[PDB]
Design an enzyme around this catalytic site. Structure first.
Site, PDB file in Angstrom:
ATOM      1  N   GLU A  16      10.024  -6.029  -4.071  1.00 18.47           N
ATOM      2  CA  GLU A  16      10.144  -5.496  -2.744  1.00 18.47           C
ATOM      3  C   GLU A  16      10.838  -6.607  -1.955  1.00 18.47           C
ATOM      4  O   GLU A  16      10.424  -7.730  -1.877  1.00 18.47           O
ATOM      5  CB  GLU A  16       8.801  -5.106  -2.136  1.00 18.47           C
ATOM      6  N   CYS A  63       4.925  -3.182   4.922  1.00 15.30           N
ATOM      7  CA  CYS A  63       5.299  -2.926   3.539  1.00 15.30           C
ATOM      8  C   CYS A  63       4.795  -1.545   3.091  1.00 15.30           C
ATOM      9  O   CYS A  63       3.652  -1.165   3.272  1.00 15.30           O
ATOM     10  CB  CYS A  63       4.657  -3.958   2.653  1.00 15.30           C
ATOM     11  N   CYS A  66       2.995  -2.095  -0.993  1.00 11.43           N
ATOM     12  CA  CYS A  66       1.585  -2.287  -0.743  1.00 11.43           C
ATOM     13  C   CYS A  66       1.234  -1.523   0.534  1.00 11.43           C
ATOM     14  O   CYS A  66       0.647  -2.043   1.475  1.00 11.43           O
ATOM     15  CB  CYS A  66       1.188  -3.757  -0.738  1.00 11.43           C
ATOM     16  N   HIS A  70      -2.123  -3.124   4.684  1.00 12.36           N
ATOM     17  CA  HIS A  70      -2.089  -3.740   6.018  1.00 12.36           C
ATOM     18  C   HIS A  70      -2.784  -2.892   7.079  1.00 12.36           C
ATOM     19  O   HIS A  70      -3.322  -3.450   8.047  1.00 12.36           O
ATOM     20  CB  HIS A  70      -0.643  -4.021   6.430  1.00 12.36           C
ATOM     21  N   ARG A 461      -1.315  -8.120  -4.567  1.00 16.09           N
ATOM     22  CA  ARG A 461      -0.666  -9.410  -4.720  1.00 16.09           C
ATOM     23  C   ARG A 461      -1.520 -10.584  -4.248  1.00 16.09           C
ATOM     24  O   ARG A 461      -1.098 -11.732  -4.361  1.00 16.09           O
ATOM     25  CB  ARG A 461       0.704  -9.385  -4.052  1.00 16.09           C
ATOM     26  N   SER A 484       2.193 -12.747  -0.552  1.00 11.56           N
ATOM     27  CA  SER A 484       3.484 -13.303  -0.944  1.00 11.56           C
ATOM     28  C   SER A 484       3.904 -14.480  -0.067  1.00 11.56           C
ATOM     29  O   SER A 484       4.722 -15.271  -0.523  1.00 11.56           O
ATOM     30  CB  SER A 484       4.570 -12.243  -0.933  1.00 11.56           C
ATOM     31  N   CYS A 528       6.913  -9.693  -2.788  1.00 13.26           N
ATOM     32  CA  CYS A 528       7.057  -8.717  -1.725  1.00 13.26           C
ATOM     33  C   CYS A 528       7.493  -9.429  -0.457  1.00 13.26           C
ATOM     34  O   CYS A 528       6.709 -10.128   0.185  1.00 13.26           O
ATOM     35  CB  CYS A 528       5.765  -7.935  -1.498  1.00 13.26           C
ATOM     36  N   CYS A 531       6.383  -8.071   3.025  1.00 11.15           N
ATOM     37  CA  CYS A 531       5.070  -8.644   3.170  1.00 11.15           C
ATOM     38  C   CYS A 531       5.118 -10.094   3.565  1.00 11.15           C
ATOM     39  O   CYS A 531       4.470 -10.530   4.522  1.00 11.15           O
ATOM     40  CB  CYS A 531       4.260  -8.503   1.864  1.00 11.15           C
TER      41      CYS A 531
END
Ligand code: SF4
Ligand code: SF4
Ligand code: F3S
Ligand SMILES: [Mg+2]
Lengths: 534, 267
Positions: A16, A63, A66, A70, A461, A484, A528, A531
């Site tokens: 991503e 994102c 994922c 969030h 992640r 990330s 990501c 992210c």
């Protein structure tokens, strides 16, 4: 035939977001690495002054890979700031949607993002489908026949004979590559399961929409709990349960056997991509205010010392900017965070990324499946221990092998298998709670004029945290510190390489024009960048 | 990467969260394997393509300069502040990339509210100067079909591409350049809670018995009355949509919705 000089990979694909990797190689081995994130959006700037209830809707758009994670972190953060204790069923429903997110995310990662680093899809055309079926049937309880695999080979043959290779155009394996080791039969099995996983992931994502409205970007969370009264009904629970059972079957009978077969063929990858320090926040709470009530517990490990796991102290996080495109050089705890963009171009004033560099007690920390698995193992988690030992036994390697790109990839499968089973336990507990007569899913709350809050998610992640300062009932500061960012951010003001940068040192590179070995290690962290930078 | 046979698609990622790419992977009847193997030739797509780095850049060049032509699908807003430096790919700004490629396409689809209208990074105070595709590239004559939503229903992308391939023209478009066949009705006029709205039966809170009974969500902020999309009709993932999950519409297929529709829990 070994290269000395630079290599740049920009874009890094099959992640991503927008990543540029730079390395220096000496005699065929990487000697130095830079992780450069090349898109900034500035969601923390955008949130200033807004209604704290609106934060989850903005931050979910950090994102869409994922997705949900969030929204969950921001809702946990504002729940925490306002002091609400959400109902038991809201915790169950939120946890079930998160469990489903992990299964979707890790299956897509292994097949659709990682596998083309190790699978030569065009060599599947040379395969004997009868031999391949025998091998597929020997690694899984699922029986695969020669005709099953010939159908896939016939479809691929028509595709390649069209001359329109589409997503396989200029692949590093075309024509052969010294670092691609699989035989044709194993390449056909993996290719068949890649294609299968394209349809299975539809079901894995649908499971999140049963309770959570839609995927991507769910819409069922509120401060105080969840909104989805239909999620209490036996029909929606049955619909979720059937999608979960089919996704679990794919994890257990397709993904994990393929992961083990590829791992066995690439056992030299136990020698590259290791890291020193690990952080994890735990996930799947019984108590929203106690991280140690989570099915996976939080923990911190330095220098691979798993005998001395340290408690997680949230006050020891600081995000550095000295090597990032932000003003100045002062690291900040996120409740005192600053997001002040200042671009200097690549390596201008020694800055080379839009990510900040989070440090824990001043150290760079890997987070994600390898950190969650190793710390839970080391805490005596019996499910993690059972699966991880079986994996090690099947590959014929010792525990040290986990500290590697291969080990990280294996840990992602381990966590998928353990979570897939635990989703059934949560589902049963949820059913049992409704049967006791608890039909409550949202609790009332009041907005304080001034408050601090933090929400913690262990996402696919790794450790995700959202941090709010409420002032006059509005967002005074809102800071995201994302997995990330930990793993793929740049150096700090002590010039410590980040986990991805350090893990690249020592990578052999057979063909600098087609540097798949760099991709194998980078992709093992599942980057990501939306992210990491937000 | 292509030639004759299947039409070539070049998919670009600007300032985006990849939720729009993920939405296309949820395609149903046809599924994404049919779309990539039979319907279309996906000749550049950074999320799933095999090539990286220089090889990926060469794949892009080969697709864009093909004599057979290509369709562009664009995800994400274009950051224009400070000469475009807030977003780069292969060390070129996204503004430069899109300025060079999109005028060469046979057709352009802006997929998702970010590409259509600027989206989340264009919300105030828009630090990166993000713009939708048609706004950013007006001066080059680019007129992308806008398929809005955050992310859109992937039914609406496939339906638009199928129409274009059959008829060699865009379908009828509304004044925001969105297809009327998908965006011609408000969410609200299609909503199962409309009889409660008409009766003035509103949930006062999410914990209320009225919310449990499925009363209208307008007092809790629902933007269904001011939002054009086909969510109640098509649903998402073949199973649900925000109001049937008990949450208000946040207006996500409308321009500037991050600023126009907030606070999300007020009307
Ligand atoms: S429109 Fe929404 S889902 Fe699509 S890229 Fe933008 S923020 Fe992500
Ligand atoms: S819930 Fe929203 S879309 Fe449905 S009737 Fe009420 S205001 Fe309209
Ligand atoms: S929030 Fe978006 S997905 Fe549909 S219900 Fe409202 S237009
Ligand atoms: Mg941040």
């Amino acid at each position: 035939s070994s290269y000395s000089g630079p290599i740049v990979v920009d874009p890094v694909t099959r992640i991503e977001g927008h990543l540029r990797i730079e390395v220096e190689v000496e005699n065929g081995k990487v000697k130095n690495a830079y992780s450069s994130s090349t898109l900034f959006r500035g969601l923390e700037i955008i949130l200033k002054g807004r209604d704290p209830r609106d934060a989850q809707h903005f931050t979910q758009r950090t994102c869409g890979v994922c997705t949900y994670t969030h929204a969950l972190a921001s809702t946990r953060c504002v729940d925490n700031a306002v002091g609400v204790h959400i109902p038991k069923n809201a915790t169950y429903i939120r946890n079930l949607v998160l469990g489903a997110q992990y299964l979707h995310d890790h299956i897509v990662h292994f097949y659709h993002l990682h596998a083309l680093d190790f699978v030569d899809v065009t060599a599947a055309l040379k395969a004997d489908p009868a031999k391949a079926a025998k091998v597929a049937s020997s690694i899984s309880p699922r029986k695969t026949t020669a005709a099953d695999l010939k159908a896939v080979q016939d479809k691929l043959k028509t595709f390649v004979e069209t001359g329109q290779l589409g997503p396989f155009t200029n692949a590093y394996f075309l024509g052969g590559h010294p670092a691609y080791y699989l035989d044709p039969e194993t390449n056909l099995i993996a290719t068949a399961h890649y294609l299968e996983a394209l349809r299975l992931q539809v079901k894995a994502a649908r499971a999140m929409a049963v309770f959570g409205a839609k995927n991507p970007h769910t819409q069922f969370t509120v401060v105080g709990g969840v909104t989805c009264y239909d999620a209490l009904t036996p029909q929606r629970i049955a619909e979720f349960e059937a999608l979960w059972k089919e996704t679990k079957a794919f994890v257990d009978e397709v993904y994990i056997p393929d992961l083990l077969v590829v791992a066995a063929a690439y056992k030299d990858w136990t020698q590259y991509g290791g890291t020193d320090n690990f952080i994890t926040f735990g996930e799947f709470p019984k108590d929203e205010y106690d991280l140690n009530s989570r099915f996976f517990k939080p923990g911190v490990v330095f220098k691979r010392d798993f005998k001395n796991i340290k408690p997680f102290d949230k006050m020891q996080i600081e995000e550095h900017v000295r090597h990032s495109w932000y003003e100045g050089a002062e690291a900040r705890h996120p409740w005192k965070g600053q997001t002040q963009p200042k671009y200097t171009d690549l390596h201008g004033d020694d800055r080379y990324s839009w990510m900040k560099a989070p440090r824990y007690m001043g150290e760079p920390m890997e987070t994600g499946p390898l950190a969650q698995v190793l710390i839970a193992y080391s805490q005596g988690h019996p499910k993690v221990k059972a699966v991880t030992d079986a994996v090690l036994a099947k590959l014929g390697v010792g525990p040290e092998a986990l500290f590697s790109t291969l080990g990280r990839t294996a840990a992602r499968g381990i966590e998928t298998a353990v979570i897939a089973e635990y989703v059934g336990v949560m589902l049963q507990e949820y059913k049992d709670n409704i049967a006791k007569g608890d039909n409550v899913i949202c609790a009332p709350w009041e907005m304080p004029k001034q408050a601090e809050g933090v929400g913690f998610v262990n996402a696919p992640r790794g450790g995700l945290s959202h941090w709010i300062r409420i002032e006059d009932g509005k967002i005074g500061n809102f800071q995201l510190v994302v997995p990330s960012t930990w793993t793929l951010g740049p150096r700090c003001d002590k010039n410590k390489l980040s986990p991805v940068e350090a893990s690249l040192i020592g990578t052999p590179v057979a063909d600098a024009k087609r540097p798949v070995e760099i991709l194998r290690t980078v992709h093992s962290f599942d980057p990501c960048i939306a992210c990491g930078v937000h | 990467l292509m030639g004759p046979r299947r039409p070539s698609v070049v998919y670009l990622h600007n300032a985006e969260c990849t939720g729009c790419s993920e939405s296309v992977l949820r395609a149903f009847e046809p599924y994404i394997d049919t779309l990539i193997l039979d319907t279309l030739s996906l000749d550049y797509h950074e999320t799933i393509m095999a090539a990286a780095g220089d090889a990926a850049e060469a794949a892009l060049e080969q697709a864009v300069n093909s004599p057979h032509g290509f369709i562009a699908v664009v995800e994400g807003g274009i950051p224009t502040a400070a000469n475009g430096i807030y977003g780069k790919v292969a060390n070129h700004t996204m503004l430069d990339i899109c300025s060079r490629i999109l005028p060469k396409a046979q057709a352009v689809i802006a997929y998702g509210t970010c590409a259509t209208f600027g989206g989340v990074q264009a919300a105030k105070p828009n630090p990166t100067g993000a713009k939708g595709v048609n706004d950013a590239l007006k001066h080059l004559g680019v007129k992308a079909i806008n398929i809005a939503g955050c992310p859109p229903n992937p039914y609406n992308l496939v339906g638009t591409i199928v129409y274009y391939l059959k008829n060699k023209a865009a379908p009828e478009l509304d004044s925001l350049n969105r297809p009327t066949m998908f965006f011609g009705q408000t969410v609200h006029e299609q909503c199962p809670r409309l009889p409660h709205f008409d009766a003035g039966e509103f949930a006062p809170s999410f914990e209320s018995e009225e919310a449990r009974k499925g009363w209208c969500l307008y007092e809790l902020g629902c933007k269904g009355p001011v939002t054009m999309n086909n969510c109640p009709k098509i649903k998402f993932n073949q199973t649900n949509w925000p109001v049937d999950a008990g949450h208000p519409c946040i207006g996500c297929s409308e321009p500037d919705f991050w600023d126009a529709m907030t606070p999300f829990y007020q009307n």
